[PDB]
Structures are given as C-alpha cells and as structure tokens.
C-alpha cells in the first residue's frame, strides 16, 4: 500500500500580475519534488536524494507541464470570479490535489481529483471514479459541465496509466 | 510525468 499526491496552488494578485503558481509532489507523504513561479529560474527541482538521478529532458518536460497549468489556473480564477459574483479586485486562491492509491500488489485502489476555492470544498472525484461531489451551487455548474464532457474518463486516462506506472518507477529508488 | 490540464471549471 503506497500513495502519491500532487498539490497545485495558484494565487491571484492585484492589477497587471500573473498569479503565483506552486506545485509540490509527495511520494507516500514525503515531498520529493517542487515547483514555484517566484524563483528567478522557475523550474521543477528534486527535494530528495534519489530523485536527482533523472535526466534533463524529464525536468524539461515536467517543467513544461507547469507552464500549462499556470495558463489553466490564470484562466480558471477568472471563471470562478463570475460563479461567485466577486469583484475583480479581490485576491483569491485555487488549489488542486490529485494522485492514486496503489495496493500491496502494486495495483490501483483509489484515485483523486479535487479542488478548493479559497479553502472551501469545490468539487471532488468520488470513489467510483465516475461521479463527482459538488459543494455549492457554483461547483454544481462545473459538475454539470464535467458530467456532459466526461471529465472522469478524461482524467481516468492518466490515473489508470502513467500515474500508477510512474509511482512504481519512484518506489524503485527507495 | 504527470496529469494533463484539467477540464475548465
């Protein structure tokens, strides 16, 4: 039984400024990787001995995703403003957490995809991995949208695949 | 490698 979690965090500032993006990786509760937008050279970097053995393309590829998640978060903060009818001056924080629970037999036991706006529950992928739980009427919109477009399935792609796979690839360096 | 961009909210 092992775990893996990623916590992404964006925080909007005021006026002409892109949010502050933050992502940290956890291998069974221990931080092994971290990204931050503030750093003069914003890049993914290892937080644990073993992890420093991966090649430059891996960091260049994993850093590239970050660039995309920033574009996503930037756009999705705006969206959330409308949902809750909030002044465009206020600063807010959107956080994402995803990952997978592998069994003793290295299989897949549970999956995770969930969000939180300014600390409150927004939407979360249920256990059956095909339905969602929405916290408020605003999240109920995201849900309906994700119900029609097949959000679960989309994510269930990465989960059942790369996620489980790459987890094991990390459990070999320990 | 990790997940792809989530579907918009």
């Amino acid at each position, epitope marked *: 039984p092992h775990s893996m979690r990623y916590y992404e965090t964006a925080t909007s500032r005021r006026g002409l400024g892109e949010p502050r993006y933050t992502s940290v990786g956890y291998v069974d509760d221990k931080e092994f990787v971290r990204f931050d937008s503030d750093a003069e050279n914003p890049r993914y970097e290892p937080q644990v001995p073993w992890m420093e053995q991966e090649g430059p393309e891996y960091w260049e590829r994993i850093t590239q995703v970050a660039k995309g998640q920033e574009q996503w978060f930037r756009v999705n903060l705006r969206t959330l403003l409308g949902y809750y009818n909030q002044s465009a001056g206020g600063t807010h924080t959107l956080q994402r957490m995803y990952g997978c629970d592998v069994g003793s037999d290295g299989r897949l036991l549970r999956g995770y995809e969930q969000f939180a706006y300014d600390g409150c529950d927004y939407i979360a992928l249920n256990e059956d991995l095909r339905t969602w739980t929405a916290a408020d009427m605003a999240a109920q919109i995201t849900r309906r949208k994700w119900e029609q477009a097949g959000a679960a399935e989309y994510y269930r792609a990465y989960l059942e695949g790369e996620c489980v796979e790459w987890l094991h690839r990390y459990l070999k360096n320990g | 490698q990790l997940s*792809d961009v989530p579907m918009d909210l």
Partner: T-cell receptor
Amino acid sequence: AVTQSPRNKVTVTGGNVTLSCRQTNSHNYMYWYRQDTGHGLRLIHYSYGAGNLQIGDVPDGYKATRTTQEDFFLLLELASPSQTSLYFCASSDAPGQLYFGEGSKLTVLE
Amino acid sequence: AQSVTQPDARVTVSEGASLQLRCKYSYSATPYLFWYVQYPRQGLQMLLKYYSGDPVVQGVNGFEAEFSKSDSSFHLRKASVHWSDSAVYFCAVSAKGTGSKLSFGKGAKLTVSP
C-alpha cells in the same frame, strides 16, 4: 450556439475583410478554421480566454483578436484569391470537443 | 507531429446496409479520439469521443467507434445506415498536452444510396 458573420461575402484582391464570431456559451477556447475540399479543416488561429492569441497551422495572411470572452475576430487585411474558402468558427470548454458555427463563404476574386 | 488519415473521400452504401469509415492516426501514448459529422450547409457536430476505458464508444443512434491500441486507429461503424446519415464524416485527434488542438482528417462524403 455559435454565430458568425457575414455568412457570405465577395471581395477583390487587396480588399479588407473581417469575419465576426460571437458565442452565447461561456467557453474559453475559440477557433477559426478554413475548409477546402482536399485539405478538410485547417486551423488558422485560436484563443484560450479573453485577450489571448495562439498561431494555428496555417496563420499566414490572417490576424485575430480575442477582444472579449464571447467575441473572436478573424482579420484578412490583404485578400488573396487563395483565401477563397469556407470559414468556420468554434468554441470549446472541453478537450477536443468543439461547437461549430454555420460557416462563412468567402470568394476572393481576381 | 500528429497526423490523421481517412483513406477514402467518397463512400457509398445501400440504405439498410452496414457501414465502416476508416481512420488511422499518428501514435500517441494517450490519444484523444473523436468523430464529427457535417450535414449539408451546416458546421461540424461531435458524433463520438474517446478518452479512456472500454475502447468501444457507443453512439445512441447506432453508430459506434473502436479505439485500437495496436492499430492506432479509431474506425467508425454502423450496422444499418439510415438515409439521413448522408453527410461528411470527419475523424479528429488530439494528444496529451495539446488536447484542445484537434488534428482533422480530409473527411469522407457518405452517400446513402436509395
């Protein structure tokens, strides 16, 4: 619901044309495509959210502006006869899932 | 990098008869697969979509598409074609990290013979 205009326009080499597209939906992604028998649909420009622009596969001779969330404009400043085509506008809030407009037939005469 | 191939631009079948429209694409470890249909003087409409899971995507109107890991294909099939099904069918794909940039096939004009 994706509406674009003008549905039909004729112009001459050198003219200036603007194709408008408005979306009742609240989608972030908007696209401009051209359809030519023998090439199917080829992406010209697209946009993720208001005030965003990203070159497409065949952006030559075109310009685009995402003025607002619901508006996306295609701009032909120097019409070439080769630009004669059926143009399409699309929106999306999910990966690979596009809603299309009825299209704009543009003939660029010599 | 990403490529979509539809073999025949012209395909005719007798009403009631079976139908298969073929589609092969460049390999992606995880690919996002779609079919679009375009009736006369309209735009494209999404017909089917695949992301993951059961590789057979079933459409409510008798259409179905199958994802083939090995073939790297996404062929469209219908047991019995109605006359309304006359239209242009497009196969499109997008890869992880660009799942919002579709690659389209040249399409196929389906003529349902009377």
